[PDB]
CSV table of C-alpha atoms and ligand atoms in Angstrom, one decimal:
chain,number,residue,atom,x,y,z
A,26,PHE,CA,90.3,77.0,129.4
A,27,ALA,CA,91.9,78.9,126.5
A,28,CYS,CA,90.8,80.7,123.3
A,29,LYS,CA,92.3,81.6,119.9
A,30,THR,CA,91.4,83.7,116.9
A,31,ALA,CA,90.8,82.3,113.5
A,32,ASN,CA,94.2,83.6,112.5
A,33,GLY,CA,95.8,81.7,115.5
A,34,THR,CA,96.5,84.5,118.0
A,35,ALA,CA,96.0,82.8,121.3
A,36,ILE,CA,95.0,84.0,124.8
A,37,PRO,CA,96.2,81.2,127.2
A,38,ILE,CA,94.9,79.9,130.5
A,39,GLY,CA,94.4,82.8,132.9
A,40,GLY,CA,93.1,85.4,130.5
A,41,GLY,CA,94.6,88.3,128.6
A,42,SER,CA,93.7,90.2,125.4
A,43,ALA,CA,93.7,89.8,121.6
A,44,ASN,CA,93.0,92.0,118.6
A,45,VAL,CA,90.4,90.7,116.1
A,46,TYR,CA,90.2,92.4,112.7
A,47,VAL,CA,86.9,91.8,110.9
A,48,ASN,CA,85.7,92.4,107.3
A,49,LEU,CA,82.5,94.5,107.2
A,50,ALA,CA,79.7,95.0,104.7
A,51,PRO,CA,81.3,97.9,102.9
A,52,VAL,CA,77.9,99.6,102.0
A,53,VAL,CA,75.0,99.6,104.5
A,54,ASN,CA,71.7,101.4,104.0
A,55,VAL,CA,69.7,103.1,106.8
A,56,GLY,CA,67.1,100.6,107.9
A,57,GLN,CA,69.4,97.7,107.0
A,58,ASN,CA,71.6,95.6,109.3
A,59,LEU,CA,75.4,95.4,109.4
A,60,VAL,CA,76.4,92.0,110.8
A,61,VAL,CA,79.6,91.5,112.7
A,62,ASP,CA,79.9,87.8,113.4
A,63,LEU,CA,82.6,86.8,115.9
A,64,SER,CA,81.6,83.2,116.0
A,65,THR,CA,83.8,82.7,112.9
A,66,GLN,CA,86.7,84.6,114.5
A,67,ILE,CA,86.8,83.5,118.2
A,68,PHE,CA,87.1,80.0,119.5
A,69,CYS,CA,87.6,78.4,122.9
A,70,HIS,CA,88.0,75.1,124.6
A,71,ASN,CA,87.9,73.4,127.9
A,72,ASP,CA,91.3,71.9,129.0
A,73,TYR,CA,89.9,69.3,131.4
A,74,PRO,CA,86.4,68.4,130.4
A,75,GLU,CA,86.8,65.1,132.2
A,76,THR,CA,86.5,66.9,135.5
A,77,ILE,CA,85.7,70.6,135.1
A,78,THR,CA,82.8,72.6,133.8
A,79,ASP,CA,83.9,76.0,132.3
A,80,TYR,CA,81.2,78.7,132.3
A,81,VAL,CA,81.4,81.5,129.7
A,82,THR,CA,79.5,84.8,129.7
A,83,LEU,CA,79.7,88.0,127.7
A,84,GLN,CA,80.4,90.1,130.7
A,85,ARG,CA,80.6,93.5,128.8
A,86,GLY,CA,80.1,94.5,125.2
A,87,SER,CA,81.5,98.0,124.7
A,88,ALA,CA,81.2,100.3,121.7
A,89,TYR,CA,83.5,102.9,120.2
A,90,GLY,CA,84.1,105.2,117.2
A,91,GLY,CA,81.6,105.0,114.3
A,92,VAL,CA,79.8,102.0,115.7
A,93,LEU,CA,78.9,104.0,118.8
A,94,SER,CA,77.7,107.2,116.9
A,95,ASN,CA,76.0,105.9,113.7
A,96,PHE,CA,74.4,102.7,114.7
A,97,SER,CA,71.7,101.2,116.9
A,98,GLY,CA,73.0,97.9,118.1
A,99,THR,CA,71.8,94.4,119.3
A,100,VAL,CA,74.2,91.6,120.3
A,101,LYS,CA,73.1,87.9,120.0
A,102,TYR,CA,74.8,85.6,122.6
A,103,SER,CA,74.2,81.8,122.2
A,104,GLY,CA,70.8,82.3,120.8
A,105,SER,CA,69.4,85.3,122.7
A,106,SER,CA,69.4,89.0,122.0
A,107,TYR,CA,70.4,91.9,124.1
A,108,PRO,CA,71.3,95.6,123.7
A,109,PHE,CA,74.6,96.5,122.3
A,110,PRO,CA,76.4,98.2,124.0
A,111,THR,CA,75.4,95.8,126.7
A,112,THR,CA,73.5,96.5,129.9
A,113,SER,CA,74.5,93.6,132.1
A,114,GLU,CA,76.5,90.4,131.9
A,115,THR,CA,74.7,87.7,129.9
A,116,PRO,CA,73.9,84.2,131.2
A,117,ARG,CA,76.7,81.7,131.4
A,118,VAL,CA,77.5,79.3,128.6
A,119,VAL,CA,79.2,75.9,129.2
A,120,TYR,CA,82.4,74.8,127.4
A,121,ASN,CA,82.6,71.0,128.1
A,122,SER,CA,84.9,70.0,125.2
A,123,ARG,CA,88.6,70.2,124.5
A,124,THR,CA,87.8,70.8,120.8
A,125,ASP,CA,87.7,74.5,120.0
A,126,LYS,CA,84.1,75.8,119.8
A,127,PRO,CA,82.9,79.2,118.5
A,128,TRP,CA,82.3,82.0,121.0
A,129,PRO,CA,78.5,82.5,119.9
A,130,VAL,CA,78.7,86.2,119.5
A,131,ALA,CA,77.3,88.3,116.6
A,132,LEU,CA,76.7,92.1,116.5
A,133,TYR,CA,73.7,93.3,114.6
A,134,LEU,CA,74.1,97.1,113.9
A,135,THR,CA,71.6,99.3,112.2
A,136,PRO,CA,72.5,102.8,111.0
A,137,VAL,CA,70.8,105.6,112.8
A,138,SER,CA,68.3,107.8,110.9
A,139,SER,CA,70.9,110.7,110.7
A,140,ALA,CA,73.5,108.2,109.4
A,141,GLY,CA,75.3,109.0,106.2
A,142,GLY,CA,78.7,109.0,104.6
A,143,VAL,CA,81.6,107.0,106.1
A,144,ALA,CA,80.0,105.5,109.2
A,145,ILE,CA,83.0,103.4,110.3
A,146,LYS,CA,86.7,104.2,109.5
A,147,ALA,CA,88.9,101.4,108.4
A,148,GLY,CA,91.3,100.3,111.1
A,149,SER,CA,89.3,101.9,113.9
A,150,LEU,CA,88.3,100.1,117.1
A,151,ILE,CA,84.6,99.3,116.8
A,152,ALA,CA,84.0,97.3,119.9
A,153,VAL,CA,85.6,95.7,123.0
A,154,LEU,CA,84.0,92.4,124.0
A,155,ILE,CA,84.8,91.0,127.5
A,156,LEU,CA,84.7,87.2,127.7
A,157,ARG,CA,84.4,86.0,131.3
A,158,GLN,CA,85.5,82.4,132.2
A,159,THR,CA,84.8,80.6,135.5
A,160,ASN,CA,84.4,76.9,136.3
A,161,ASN,CA,82.9,74.5,138.9
A,162,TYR,CA,86.4,73.6,140.3
A,163,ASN,CA,88.3,76.5,141.9
A,164,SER,CA,87.9,80.3,142.3
A,165,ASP,CA,89.2,81.1,138.8
A,166,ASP,CA,87.7,84.2,137.3
A,167,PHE,CA,89.5,85.1,134.1
A,168,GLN,CA,89.0,87.8,131.5
A,169,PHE,CA,89.6,87.3,127.7
A,170,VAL,CA,89.5,90.7,126.1
A,171,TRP,CA,88.6,91.0,122.4
A,172,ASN,CA,89.5,94.3,120.8
A,173,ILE,CA,87.4,94.3,117.6
A,174,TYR,CA,89.0,96.4,114.8
A,175,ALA,CA,87.4,97.5,111.5
A,176,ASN,CA,89.3,96.1,108.5
A,177,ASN,CA,87.6,98.6,106.1
A,178,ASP,CA,85.4,101.7,105.8
A,179,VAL,CA,81.7,101.3,105.9
A,180,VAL,CA,79.6,103.8,103.9
A,181,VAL,CA,75.9,104.6,104.4
A,182,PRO,CA,74.5,105.7,101.0
A,183,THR,CA,73.1,109.3,101.1
B,210,LIG,O1,89.0,74.3,131.5
B,210,LIG,C1,89.1,73.8,132.8
B,210,LIG,C2,90.1,74.6,133.6
B,210,LIG,O2,91.5,74.5,133.0
B,210,LIG,C3,92.4,75.4,133.7
B,210,LIG,O3,92.6,74.9,135.0
B,210,LIG,C4,92.9,73.6,135.4
B,210,LIG,C5,93.0,73.4,136.8
B,210,LIG,C6,93.3,72.1,137.3
B,210,LIG,C7,93.4,71.0,136.4
B,210,LIG,C8,93.7,69.7,136.9
B,210,LIG,C9,93.3,69.2,138.1
B,210,LIG,C10,93.6,67.9,138.6
B,210,LIG,C11,94.4,67.1,137.8
B,210,LIG,C12,94.9,67.5,136.6
B,210,LIG,C13,94.6,68.8,136.1
B,210,LIG,C14,93.3,71.3,135.0
B,210,LIG,C15,93.0,72.6,134.5
B,210,LIG,C16,92.0,76.8,133.8
B,210,LIG,O4,92.1,77.4,132.6
B,210,LIG,C17,90.6,76.9,134.4
B,210,LIG,O5,90.0,78.2,134.5
B,210,LIG,C18,89.6,76.0,133.6
B,210,LIG,O6,88.4,76.0,134.4
């Protein structure tokens, strides 16, 4: 099992970490949702689908900076919703193909009532997503860290 970003930065067999830089809605109103969709940025595949089932959770979705102080957050994993920042590991998803498949992860962040001005600072770290990979074959328990970085400021109209 391995993953890669849309720009081609890879995290090989065994885990590791990568930086993902995402473009955001530049202007977001209170009562409106800012969508960070990593299913366009993060892909993974199973190296031996003939024999092995890879199982993939979001183990932890952690929040920093302006995403942590100005937004209320939900995280959609493979079709179900959860709090973001997360409260427990999600259910396991199966990668059974060598073709690279999206990691089905999307942040849905809503500005808090007191939000206003520059809610997210360009180039800050807005989130750390922990991908957890196991299988049905050995005792492999591997961690693919995604450090999510803002490509641009986000303003909440005042
Ligand atoms: O995606 C599946 C796995 O691929 C990696 O591990 C192995 C371990 C063993 C074999 C193998 C076994 C017998 C003959 C030829 C190859 C192939 C891959 C490893 O990434 C792991 O976590 C992941 O479950």
